Amino acid sequence: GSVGFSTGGWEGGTYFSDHTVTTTNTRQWYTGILNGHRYSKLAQTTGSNLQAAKPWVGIQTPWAYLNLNCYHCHFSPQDWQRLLNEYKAWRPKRMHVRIYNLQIKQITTVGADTLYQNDLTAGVHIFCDGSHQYPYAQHPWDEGASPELPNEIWKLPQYAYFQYQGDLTDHATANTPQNVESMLRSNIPLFLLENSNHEVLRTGEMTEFSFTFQSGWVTNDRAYCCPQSDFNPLVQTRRYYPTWNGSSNSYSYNRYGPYKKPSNWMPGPGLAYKGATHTNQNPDDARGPIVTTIAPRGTISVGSTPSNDAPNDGDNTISSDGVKQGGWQTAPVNGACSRTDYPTLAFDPSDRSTNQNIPTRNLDIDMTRWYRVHEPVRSGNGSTYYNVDDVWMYPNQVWNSTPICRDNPIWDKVPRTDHHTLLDSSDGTLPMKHPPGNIFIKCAKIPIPTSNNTDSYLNIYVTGQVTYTVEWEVQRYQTKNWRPELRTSAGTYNQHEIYNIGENGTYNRANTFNECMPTKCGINRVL
Amino acid sequence: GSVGFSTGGWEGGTYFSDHTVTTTNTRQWYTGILNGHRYSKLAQTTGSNLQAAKPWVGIQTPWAYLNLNCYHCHFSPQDWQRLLNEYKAWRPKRMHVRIYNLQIKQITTVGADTLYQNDLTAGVHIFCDGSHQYPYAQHPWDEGASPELPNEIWKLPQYAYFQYQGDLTDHATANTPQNVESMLRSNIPLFLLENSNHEVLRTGEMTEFSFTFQSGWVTNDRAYCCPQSDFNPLVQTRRYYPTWNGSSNSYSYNRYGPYKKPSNWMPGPGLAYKGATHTNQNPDDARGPIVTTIAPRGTISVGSTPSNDAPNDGDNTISSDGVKQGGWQTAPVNGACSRTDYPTLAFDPSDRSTNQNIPTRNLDIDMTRWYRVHEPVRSGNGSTYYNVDDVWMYPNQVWNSTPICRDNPIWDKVPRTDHHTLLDSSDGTLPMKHPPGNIFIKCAKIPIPTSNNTDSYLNIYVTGQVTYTVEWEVQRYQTKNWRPELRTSAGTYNQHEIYNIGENGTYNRANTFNECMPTKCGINRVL
Amino acid sequence: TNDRAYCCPQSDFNPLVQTRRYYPTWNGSSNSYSYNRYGPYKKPSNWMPGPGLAYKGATHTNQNPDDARGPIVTTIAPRGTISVGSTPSNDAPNDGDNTISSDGVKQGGWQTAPVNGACSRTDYPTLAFDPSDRSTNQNIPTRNLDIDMTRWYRVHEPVRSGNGSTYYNVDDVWMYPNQVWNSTPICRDNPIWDKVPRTDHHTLLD
Amino acid sequence: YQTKNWRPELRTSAGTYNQHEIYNIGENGTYNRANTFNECMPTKCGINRVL
Amino acid sequence: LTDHATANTPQNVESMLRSNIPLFLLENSNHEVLRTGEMTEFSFTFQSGWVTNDRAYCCPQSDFNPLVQTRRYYPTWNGSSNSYSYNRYGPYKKPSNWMPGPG
Amino acid sequence: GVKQGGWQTAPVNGACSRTDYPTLAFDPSDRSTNQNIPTRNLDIDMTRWYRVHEPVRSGNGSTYYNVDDVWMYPNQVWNSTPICRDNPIWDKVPRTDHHTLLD
């Protein structure tokens, strides 16, 4: 008889050790009924009017889901400081999630007054998709992650997923196969969570989930030198550099100076592009820096026209408007270029922020990450130094990843595909094949009798507690550095009261990326 | 199925034996929702206006806590009488606290009428901090301790804690380091009880806590003589006292009279100061007798100005107003001086007292505690007898502690610091490293669905029973005294009906410190 | 000990709860006291500011590095001996004791510094040092930074005087019961230990 | 140390010092030492204890 | 490197770099001190790829058999019809799946 | 600024044999007085490419674009440069979060 028995306590606190950090967090969560207990088409209405449907079309579900992906979910500002000061590297190992102390209440109107009364026999649907049968649909930077403050109520975000690009229209030429658009539309998936197995829980019940991570490392230490400066000037190099003689049409040689020795190591791959920065209008346009247009041959997308003049030769050229609303954008794409760390990653530390100050990633002091790359080419009497904005993958590229802050997402799901290149994120998330599965939650749909076969349900909502524990594998730094180093310190910040509760419970959050306590500031690594 | 089963009975009564007294008390307690389930800045607005913030700034929490610290919590007036009459000494050994028979009710408005209905699935957060991770914030003399009468309802007091002194402002001179105020403000702690582990209980559940005391003794017997009178006049002393001869510029000697023999034993340390008694206005001013101004070099407090004239030499002198609102006061500081027992300890016997008569400690008949101390110094023809208001710690000081009454606090937490001197309280509480930990209680925060992301919770309150049992180590007196002695007796009091229930349930409480049944009145100890 | 106190023991209470304690007010007409509850935002504390002697020493001149400046200067000499700049004084209080001139105390005495104890006001400038031996640096590190909140700036004993009260600065706070304090901060350039002199008695070692 | 403090704290950091090159070897082997007591890295700055 | 402060940059980055420079003194580690009658030795184990002495006499793209026809066709753009027509690759250049290495 | 401020990576020829020369030149020994400087001009391996062209239909004919930068792309296959007795044996891989293929 667990109506009067709790199914759990409250669990909080972090534990530090040499090889392990364990974070434990409990939140009170709730969800009401979403989308009237039904699945429905979700389509974007925004964007400049064009003779086509808007690109994103999908399904919004009745379900809600748990999002644990961000560091401020797991670490308090204190704990994050201690992680960054005492450890050169960490990665998540295993996560345990308990859902318990469930309460299901009927929302009742007896009059001008709204009543909240237990329905003791009402259930809650809880489903973890761990085999990734359903669309994951988790953008790492989404709001609706577990709130930073343990005392804050967490309203579950609603689950929706992409279905098809609505902008695609049938296009028939001598250069295309027939009926490709209808072929795409016929093949769109529909995912209903009710054709899978899940648990239904009443108020005296609990459920739990365990996940094991496989990921690379987040690395807190930085390089104080680039690989290319890293030689010894007191020793001469045997290497010579050529000088072209226009008279003899040959080369002569001179020893490289001891203070620049040619390196075998390439600057890491980096794409320095801002994207389209020219206007703030139309938040649903694809700004950049990389915009990808998907469309199969035989279909034509927004603002696309076939072009019969070379190089295109029957391919569809896409106007600015077409690329802008039709395409899908990848940002940041800076890679190893530190010049474009800014302003290509900017975020709110929390959801629904009223702060006018937007933290943007301006601080990278790691010295393997490059500002500019130049290819000098002999031209006439002198040489022309060509800035290279696109440094692609090339052998012997060696670089460090961007710094991250407590407000970054922890992981990003690697799309399941035939092939992928090296996995390094420009935003710093850990790419994971098999990230922890979506934990889906919805109130039971309790029908109300109707004579006319209308869909009428009882108005209820579930609240409960969720405890999530992450075991973090972690490595303490060791150094022979004689000097003291930069450390994350509260005294660095222009906002002295940051992460403190103020008048009327206002909680102070970072104005800047530095106040978000970024990694790779303090600890020197030897290359 | 404990919805219909109680988790405990009612436990009351005291048990006396030779070496042990056991008090058992049960109270019905409740708390509603505090501070709207949130943490917020708590700042004092009172005091004379000054160009600075008011000193005390802190955090008021959603939590409530149990306060067992006072004797009238544990002992009935009868039981206290018997303790003081039959025992020379006692100390608390172990305490057991049970919280049970929990009821959690929703407060509902259906109309002009307010309804109280069980929420059977609602929880209660109960947390004991026994490792003193959170601020203790218990002033021994606070109200909100368990009520004296077993039948009285106990409303849990709300927990709040100090954070920083708001009066401190940055002060930069050649004599100070830079940016100390921002350094203080940056380093202020924030304590959220939800990052620790605690129990959540529904109505069919209970919890219990055990504590072990380490303390010195409360001592009921008194000295009938001072150490300095304690000799035998029928025997001559070999000791001589000097007399200065101004003519020969030397000393001559004469045997001490047998009825004052010089003693090796110093009067105990005592600071005789009233504090600032001149006005009753501004209850938040620091009156005395010892006022401590905290402020680091590089900061400047209220009413402070740097003074470049000696002795100060760049130190900040503080005006009366600055000391008055800015400082922190220590009272009583009488120590072994009985002259300043009055009026330096005065209190209400109970919380929210309407009695105009305020018990103040005027009765100390222990003879080791001194009225005045004089240092005579030869001056001219005679000698000048200098009153000494400050007797500091000196070797061979020997003294008895102040008497206490049933309305005193039992213990006081020793602040955790690098160093402390001898622990003797002028108010009589037992200093304890590791006093019993705060038991924190709050109603679960049960969210109400809102579309606009406002914070809206279900209005509930918890009531329960708390049983607390203290085992007291105790010592019976033994004496060869031939004569009968003073004993605590109901017939001593001008109020004959004291501790009786009167018309309409009015409970009579002590008008005077004597009616509070003070210790160290009755039993003679041999020195 | 590396950790610090962010509050003094005397601020450390809960203002949301009233105190049962009252403070006296003297009535000169009735020659008695009346009582009023302490305000919830200053609750009288059982805990004394730690012992502290706020004295600079003799700061007036830089000459004569071998003079005993302070803040505590101890003259040793047994009865039957006379030290530098000492003369017997037959006028009270001295009565045959040797009074010592400034010069005598100055070169003859032995100095104890720092003697600030729990007073943070005199942390400066009573501890100043070179980080290394034979330093050429004109900048002398001196201990100006103490943010520990148990260590006190000033102590006042207010005493009712006439119509108002006089607030007496206390430069000497001696050992007294229920004093609780944290030790001074140290730096990487401090000595680790000091040998306790072997003696019959010593007080608390801080 | 162990703390339940929610907030980050002061820590000893090289970036605090007006002398940026402190404890570094300079020209001709000159070793840079603290000008101030803060540059000597004093204790009891960072960690909060609960009383 | 010199400090540069604009609306587009964070503050005090140069001093931040200069403050964080390492200093390495070999005397804070453990090493051997040897007098004239003493010796010391060290062992190392390599992990590496191979140095390769043999060469390719052909590129991967020439490496086919001309006596066999390829089924593959190559496009030719017709500007009049705006479409492609196809012709079998000649047996002596067969399109290769293998790209020239990065250079 | 680029010239004195930057740090240079050479050789970066990769699989291009055209730029084997003159991008690697050295003395065989230290403090050489020899005016003749060995420079790597001899690569007869046939997987290593001289030029790469992307032809693009332009007007009536096609334009053959020389490609001086061939980046990493799938199905690139190549042999490493020849080495001589005077080359270094190894190079320390910088310790970093990421590296591409090591050649």
Side-chain angles (χ1 to χ4, degrees), chain B residues 139 142 280 297 315-316 327 333 348 378 421, chain C residues 22-23 42-44 56 95 121 153 176 178:
Chain B
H139 186 273
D142 285 343
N280 66 346
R297 183 175 296 277
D315 288 344
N316 294 336
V333 296
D348 285 344
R378 188 182 71 83
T421 58
Chain C
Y22 285 72
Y23 58 84
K42 290 186 185 298
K43 291 178 178 178
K56 274 70 178 181
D95 289 345
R121 179 169 64 86
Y153 186 78
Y176 187 79
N178 286 341

PDB file of all heavy atoms in Angstrom, chain B residues 139 142 280 297 315-316 327 333 348 378 421, chain C residues 22-23 42-44 56 95 121 153 176 178:
ATOM      1  N   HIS B 139      20.741  30.819  17.099  1.00  0.00           N
ATOM      2  CA  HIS B 139      21.072  31.594  18.262  1.00  0.00           C
ATOM      3  C   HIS B 139      20.431  30.926  19.460  1.00  0.00           C
ATOM      4  O   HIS B 139      19.228  30.644  19.422  1.00  0.00           O
ATOM      5  CB  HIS B 139      20.597  33.025  18.114  1.00  0.00           C
ATOM      6  CG  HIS B 139      21.043  33.918  19.220  1.00  0.00           C
ATOM      7  ND1 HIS B 139      20.335  34.059  20.391  1.00  0.00           N
ATOM      8  CD2 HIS B 139      22.156  34.672  19.357  1.00  0.00           C
ATOM      9  CE1 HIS B 139      20.972  34.895  21.186  1.00  0.00           C
ATOM     10  NE2 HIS B 139      22.081  35.282  20.583  1.00  0.00           N
ATOM     11  N   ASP B 142      16.938  31.955  20.723  1.00  0.00           N
ATOM     12  CA  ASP B 142      15.864  32.151  19.757  1.00  0.00           C
ATOM     13  C   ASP B 142      14.528  31.627  20.254  1.00  0.00           C
ATOM     14  O   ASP B 142      14.446  30.662  21.016  1.00  0.00           O
ATOM     15  CB  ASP B 142      16.199  31.462  18.439  1.00  0.00           C
ATOM     16  CG  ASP B 142      17.226  32.207  17.644  1.00  0.00           C
ATOM     17  OD1 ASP B 142      17.450  33.393  17.940  1.00  0.00           O
ATOM     18  OD2 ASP B 142      17.808  31.609  16.719  1.00  0.00           O
ATOM     19  N   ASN B 280      16.632  53.334  24.593  1.00  0.00           N
ATOM     20  CA  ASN B 280      15.978  52.096  24.203  1.00  0.00           C
ATOM     21  C   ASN B 280      15.721  52.006  22.709  1.00  0.00           C
ATOM     22  O   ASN B 280      15.294  50.951  22.234  1.00  0.00           O
ATOM     23  CB  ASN B 280      14.662  51.933  24.962  1.00  0.00           C
ATOM     24  CG  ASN B 280      13.637  52.983  24.599  1.00  0.00           C
ATOM     25  OD1 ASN B 280      13.952  53.993  23.974  1.00  0.00           O
ATOM     26  ND2 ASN B 280      12.399  52.750  24.997  1.00  0.00           N
ATOM     27  N   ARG B 297      41.178  45.124   5.844  1.00  0.00           N
ATOM     28  CA  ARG B 297      41.910  46.230   5.258  1.00  0.00           C
ATOM     29  C   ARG B 297      41.676  46.259   3.756  1.00  0.00           C
ATOM     30  O   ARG B 297      41.712  45.228   3.083  1.00  0.00           O
ATOM     31  CB  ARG B 297      43.390  46.104   5.586  1.00  0.00           C
ATOM     32  CG  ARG B 297      44.228  47.239   5.079  1.00  0.00           C
ATOM     33  CD  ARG B 297      45.639  47.079   5.550  1.00  0.00           C
ATOM     34  NE  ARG B 297      45.655  47.182   7.001  1.00  0.00           N
ATOM     35  CZ  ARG B 297      45.681  48.331   7.660  1.00  0.00           C
ATOM     36  NH1 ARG B 297      45.709  49.478   6.999  1.00  0.00           N
ATOM     37  NH2 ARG B 297      45.676  48.335   8.978  1.00  0.00           N
ATOM     38  N   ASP B 315      44.801  53.870   9.849  1.00  0.00           N
ATOM     39  CA  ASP B 315      43.659  53.046  10.203  1.00  0.00           C
ATOM     40  C   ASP B 315      42.375  53.865  10.156  1.00  0.00           C
ATOM     41  O   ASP B 315      42.381  55.094  10.258  1.00  0.00           O
ATOM     42  CB  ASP B 315      43.830  52.441  11.594  1.00  0.00           C
ATOM     43  CG  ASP B 315      44.874  51.355  11.630  1.00  0.00           C
ATOM     44  OD1 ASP B 315      45.250  50.850  10.555  1.00  0.00           O
ATOM     45  OD2 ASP B 315      45.318  51.002  12.738  1.00  0.00           O
ATOM     46  N   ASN B 316      41.265  53.162  10.005  1.00  0.00           N
ATOM     47  CA  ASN B 316      39.954  53.786   9.961  1.00  0.00           C
ATOM     48  C   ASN B 316      39.430  53.920  11.383  1.00  0.00           C
ATOM     49  O   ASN B 316      39.268  52.917  12.082  1.00  0.00           O
ATOM     50  CB  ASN B 316      38.998  52.946   9.121  1.00  0.00           C
ATOM     51  CG  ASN B 316      39.393  52.900   7.671  1.00  0.00           C
ATOM     52  OD1 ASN B 316      40.073  53.790   7.172  1.00  0.00           O
ATOM     53  ND2 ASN B 316      38.996  51.840   6.989  1.00  0.00           N
ATOM     54  N   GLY B 327      28.652  47.276  14.094  1.00  0.00           N
ATOM     55  CA  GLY B 327      29.359  46.264  14.846  1.00  0.00           C
ATOM     56  C   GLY B 327      28.488  45.088  15.224  1.00  0.00           C
ATOM     57  O   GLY B 327      27.277  45.081  15.051  1.00  0.00           O
ATOM     58  N   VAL B 333      29.013  39.466  28.972  1.00  0.00           N
ATOM     59  CA  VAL B 333      30.449  39.206  29.020  1.00  0.00           C
ATOM     60  C   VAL B 333      30.955  39.360  30.446  1.00  0.00           C
ATOM     61  O   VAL B 333      32.129  39.617  30.674  1.00  0.00           O
ATOM     62  CB  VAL B 333      31.235  40.181  28.133  1.00  0.00           C
ATOM     63  CG1 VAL B 333      30.859  40.007  26.670  1.00  0.00           C
ATOM     64  CG2 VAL B 333      31.007  41.608  28.597  1.00  0.00           C
ATOM     65  N   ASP B 348      12.614  36.743  28.000  1.00  0.00           N
ATOM     66  CA  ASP B 348      11.295  36.171  28.191  1.00  0.00           C
ATOM     67  C   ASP B 348      11.416  34.680  28.448  1.00  0.00           C
ATOM     68  O   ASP B 348      12.239  34.015  27.816  1.00  0.00           O
ATOM     69  CB  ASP B 348      10.408  36.406  26.981  1.00  0.00           C
ATOM     70  CG  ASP B 348       9.910  37.822  26.893  1.00  0.00           C
ATOM     71  OD1 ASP B 348       9.993  38.540  27.906  1.00  0.00           O
ATOM     72  OD2 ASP B 348       9.432  38.220  25.816  1.00  0.00           O
ATOM     73  N   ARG B 378      50.191  52.436  46.224  1.00  0.00           N
ATOM     74  CA  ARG B 378      50.622  53.478  47.140  1.00  0.00           C
ATOM     75  C   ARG B 378      50.673  54.798  46.394  1.00  0.00           C
ATOM     76  O   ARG B 378      51.277  54.896  45.325  1.00  0.00           O
ATOM     77  CB  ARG B 378      51.993  53.162  47.728  1.00  0.00           C
ATOM     78  CG  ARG B 378      52.383  54.134  48.828  1.00  0.00           C
ATOM     79  CD  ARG B 378      53.757  53.874  49.408  1.00  0.00           C
ATOM     80  NE  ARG B 378      54.816  54.214  48.473  1.00  0.00           N
ATOM     81  CZ  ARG B 378      55.285  55.446  48.316  1.00  0.00           C
ATOM     82  NH1 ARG B 378      54.789  56.439  49.036  1.00  0.00           N
ATOM     83  NH2 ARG B 378      56.252  55.685  47.451  1.00  0.00           N
ATOM     84  N   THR B 421      39.831  30.139  23.279  1.00  0.00           N
ATOM     85  CA  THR B 421      40.268  30.115  24.662  1.00  0.00           C
ATOM     86  C   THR B 421      39.384  29.158  25.450  1.00  0.00           C
ATOM     87  O   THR B 421      38.578  28.415  24.888  1.00  0.00           O
ATOM     88  CB  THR B 421      40.254  31.517  25.259  1.00  0.00           C
ATOM     89  OG1 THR B 421      38.935  32.063  25.173  1.00  0.00           O
ATOM     90  CG2 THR B 421      41.222  32.402  24.525  1.00  0.00           C
TER      91      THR B 421
ATOM     92  N   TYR C  22      16.494  40.399  26.035  1.00  0.00           N
ATOM     93  CA  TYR C  22      16.209  41.816  26.179  1.00  0.00           C
ATOM     94  C   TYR C  22      17.482  42.571  26.514  1.00  0.00           C
ATOM     95  O   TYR C  22      18.412  42.017  27.099  1.00  0.00           O
ATOM     96  CB  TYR C  22      15.162  42.044  27.274  1.00  0.00           C
ATOM     97  CG  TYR C  22      13.767  41.685  26.852  1.00  0.00           C
ATOM     98  CD1 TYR C  22      13.396  40.369  26.695  1.00  0.00           C
ATOM     99  CD2 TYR C  22      12.862  42.663  26.489  1.00  0.00           C
ATOM    100  CE1 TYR C  22      12.153  40.041  26.262  1.00  0.00           C
ATOM    101  CE2 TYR C  22      11.596  42.345  26.068  1.00  0.00           C
ATOM    102  CZ  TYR C  22      11.249  41.027  25.950  1.00  0.00           C
ATOM    103  OH  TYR C  22       9.998  40.684  25.518  1.00  0.00           O
ATOM    104  N   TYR C  23      17.507  43.835  26.155  1.00  0.00           N
ATOM    105  CA  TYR C  23      18.638  44.647  26.540  1.00  0.00           C
ATOM    106  C   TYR C  23      18.194  45.739  27.500  1.00  0.00           C
ATOM    107  O   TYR C  23      17.071  46.236  27.411  1.00  0.00           O
ATOM    108  CB  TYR C  23      19.326  45.284  25.325  1.00  0.00           C
ATOM    109  CG  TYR C  23      18.430  46.156  24.487  1.00  0.00           C
ATOM    110  CD1 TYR C  23      18.198  47.477  24.825  1.00  0.00           C
ATOM    111  CD2 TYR C  23      17.851  45.667  23.327  1.00  0.00           C
ATOM    112  CE1 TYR C  23      17.389  48.267  24.064  1.00  0.00           C
ATOM    113  CE2 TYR C  23      17.043  46.458  22.554  1.00  0.00           C
ATOM    114  CZ  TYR C  23      16.818  47.758  22.926  1.00  0.00           C
ATOM    115  OH  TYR C  23      16.017  48.557  22.155  1.00  0.00           O
ATOM    116  N   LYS C  42      20.518  42.156  15.139  1.00  0.00           N
ATOM    117  CA  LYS C  42      21.697  41.927  15.960  1.00  0.00           C
ATOM    118  C   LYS C  42      21.284  41.134  17.183  1.00  0.00           C
ATOM    119  O   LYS C  42      20.673  41.646  18.117  1.00  0.00           O
ATOM    120  CB  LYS C  42      22.399  43.222  16.351  1.00  0.00           C
ATOM    121  CG  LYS C  42      23.060  43.886  15.192  1.00  0.00           C
ATOM    122  CD  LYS C  42      23.857  45.066  15.601  1.00  0.00           C
ATOM    123  CE  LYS C  42      24.388  45.742  14.378  1.00  0.00           C
ATOM    124  NZ  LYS C  42      25.292  44.879  13.582  1.00  0.00           N
ATOM    125  N   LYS C  43      21.705  39.897  17.209  1.00  0.00           N
ATOM    126  CA  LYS C  43      21.468  39.081  18.368  1.00  0.00           C
ATOM    127  C   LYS C  43      22.745  39.011  19.189  1.00  0.00           C
ATOM    128  O   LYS C  43      23.821  38.766  18.641  1.00  0.00           O
ATOM    129  CB  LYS C  43      20.997  37.691  17.966  1.00  0.00           C
ATOM    130  CG  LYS C  43      19.621  37.711  17.364  1.00  0.00           C
ATOM    131  CD  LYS C  43      19.172  36.350  16.930  1.00  0.00           C
ATOM    132  CE  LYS C  43      17.770  36.408  16.390  1.00  0.00           C
ATOM    133  NZ  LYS C  43      17.308  35.091  15.910  1.00  0.00           N
ATOM    134  N   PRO C  44      22.669  39.277  20.480  1.00  0.00           N
ATOM    135  CA  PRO C  44      23.860  39.172  21.319  1.00  0.00           C
ATOM    136  C   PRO C  44      24.465  37.786  21.223  1.00  0.00           C
ATOM    137  O   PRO C  44      23.763  36.776  21.197  1.00  0.00           O
ATOM    138  CB  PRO C  44      23.328  39.471  22.721  1.00  0.00           C
ATOM    139  CG  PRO C  44      21.901  39.118  22.638  1.00  0.00           C
ATOM    140  CD  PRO C  44      21.452  39.471  21.275  1.00  0.00           C
ATOM    141  N   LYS C  56      51.469  49.376  16.949  1.00  0.00           N
ATOM    142  CA  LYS C  56      52.392  49.320  15.828  1.00  0.00           C
ATOM    143  C   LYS C  56      53.810  49.037  16.294  1.00  0.00           C
ATOM    144  O   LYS C  56      54.598  48.427  15.567  1.00  0.00           O
ATOM    145  CB  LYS C  56      52.332  50.622  15.042  1.00  0.00           C
ATOM    146  CG  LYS C  56      51.243  50.666  13.996  1.00  0.00           C
ATOM    147  CD  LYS C  56      49.875  50.743  14.625  1.00  0.00           C
ATOM    148  CE  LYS C  56      48.801  50.842  13.572  1.00  0.00           C
ATOM    149  NZ  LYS C  56      47.457  50.945  14.175  1.00  0.00           N
ATOM    150  N   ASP C  95      58.760  52.773  43.893  1.00  0.00           N
ATOM    151  CA  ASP C  95      59.234  52.432  45.232  1.00  0.00           C
ATOM    152  C   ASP C  95      60.496  51.565  45.182  1.00  0.00           C
ATOM    153  O   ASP C  95      60.509  50.401  45.572  1.00  0.00           O
ATOM    154  CB  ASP C  95      58.117  51.750  46.034  1.00  0.00           C
ATOM    155  CG  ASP C  95      57.005  52.713  46.423  1.00  0.00           C
ATOM    156  OD1 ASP C  95      57.211  53.940  46.328  1.00  0.00           O
ATOM    157  OD2 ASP C  95      55.927  52.250  46.839  1.00  0.00           O
ATOM    158  N   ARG C 121      43.280  44.644  11.991  1.00  0.00           N
ATOM    159  CA  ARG C 121      43.656  46.020  11.715  1.00  0.00           C
ATOM    160  C   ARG C 121      45.165  46.190  11.761  1.00  0.00           C
ATOM    161  O   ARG C 121      45.741  46.922  10.951  1.00  0.00           O
ATOM    162  CB  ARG C 121      42.946  46.948  12.696  1.00  0.00           C
ATOM    163  CG  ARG C 121      43.263  48.401  12.549  1.00  0.00           C
ATOM    164  CD  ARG C 121      42.310  49.231  13.377  1.00  0.00           C
ATOM    165  NE  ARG C 121      42.390  49.014  14.815  1.00  0.00           N
ATOM    166  CZ  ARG C 121      43.243  49.629  15.619  1.00  0.00           C
ATOM    167  NH1 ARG C 121      44.103  50.504  15.128  1.00  0.00           N
ATOM    168  NH2 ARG C 121      43.221  49.377  16.912  1.00  0.00           N
ATOM    169  N   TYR C 153      38.551  44.053  13.265  1.00  0.00           N
ATOM    170  CA  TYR C 153      39.153  45.338  12.964  1.00  0.00           C
ATOM    171  C   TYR C 153      39.265  46.198  14.218  1.00  0.00           C
ATOM    172  O   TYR C 153      40.364  46.588  14.609  1.00  0.00           O
ATOM    173  CB  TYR C 153      38.355  46.055  11.877  1.00  0.00           C
ATOM    174  CG  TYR C 153      39.014  47.325  11.438  1.00  0.00           C
ATOM    175  CD1 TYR C 153      40.088  47.285  10.572  1.00  0.00           C
ATOM    176  CD2 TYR C 153      38.593  48.554  11.902  1.00  0.00           C
ATOM    177  CE1 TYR C 153      40.710  48.422  10.163  1.00  0.00           C
ATOM    178  CE2 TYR C 153      39.214  49.702  11.501  1.00  0.00           C
ATOM    179  CZ  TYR C 153      40.274  49.628  10.627  1.00  0.00           C
ATOM    180  OH  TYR C 153      40.916  50.758  10.207  1.00  0.00           O
ATOM    181  N   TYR C 176      40.405  35.894  27.115  1.00  0.00           N
ATOM    182  CA  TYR C 176      39.187  35.909  27.898  1.00  0.00           C
ATOM    183  C   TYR C 176      38.401  34.679  27.491  1.00  0.00           C
ATOM    184  O   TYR C 176      38.579  34.175  26.380  1.00  0.00           O
ATOM    185  CB  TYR C 176      38.399  37.199  27.647  1.00  0.00           C
ATOM    186  CG  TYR C 176      37.211  37.387  28.537  1.00  0.00           C
ATOM    187  CD1 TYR C 176      37.376  37.831  29.838  1.00  0.00           C
ATOM    188  CD2 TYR C 176      35.935  37.125  28.095  1.00  0.00           C
ATOM    189  CE1 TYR C 176      36.307  38.003  30.670  1.00  0.00           C
ATOM    190  CE2 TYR C 176      34.859  37.299  28.913  1.00  0.00           C
ATOM    191  CZ  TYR C 176      35.050  37.744  30.204  1.00  0.00           C
ATOM    192  OH  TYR C 176      33.990  37.927  31.047  1.00  0.00           O
ATOM    193  N   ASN C 178      35.680  32.176  26.014  1.00  0.00           N
ATOM    194  CA  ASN C 178      34.828  32.196  24.822  1.00  0.00           C
ATOM    195  C   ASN C 178      35.351  33.125  23.735  1.00  0.00           C
ATOM    196  O   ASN C 178      34.581  33.673  22.952  1.00  0.00           O
ATOM    197  CB  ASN C 178      33.383  32.558  25.151  1.00  0.00           C
ATOM    198  CG  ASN C 178      32.646  31.446  25.809  1.00  0.00           C
ATOM    199  OD1 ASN C 178      33.039  30.289  25.750  1.00  0.00           O
ATOM    200  ND2 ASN C 178      31.514  31.777  26.378  1.00  0.00           N
TER     201      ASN C 178
END
